[PDB]
Amino acid sequence: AKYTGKCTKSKNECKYKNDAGKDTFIKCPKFDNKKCTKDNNKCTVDTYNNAVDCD
């Protein structure tokens, strides 16, 4: 599935709510694009492939 969440810069992590309403965390990639560039930026998670892209 594809979820949209919000990321935090320092921890470089995406937080999204799954369909049960549970906050779930998945680290952004560390190097260049796909890393979180500002607190509360959008991030898109693909739970089929365990992949995230952070803004």
Residue numbers in the entry: 1 to 55
Which lines from the publication concern this structure?
PAF is a small (∼6.2 kDa, 55 residues) lysine-rich protein (13 × Lys, pI ≃ 9) and a potent agent against Aspergillus species and dermatophytes. The NMR structure is a twisted β-barrel composed of five antiparallel β-strands and stabilized by three disulfide bridges. Despite the varying size and conformational flexibility, sclx4, sclx6 and sclx8 bound similarly the Pro29-Lys30-Phe31 motif in loop 3.
The interactions of sclx8 with PAF were similar to those observed with sclx6, though less extensive. At twice the size of sclx4 it might be expected that sclx8 would mask a larger protein surface; however, sclx8 formed a PAF dimer [Figs. 2(c) and 4(c)] resulting in a total protein surface coverage of ∼950 Å2. Salt-bridge interactions involved up to three lysines from each monomer. Here, again a hydrogen bond was formed between the Lys30 Nα and a phenolic OH.
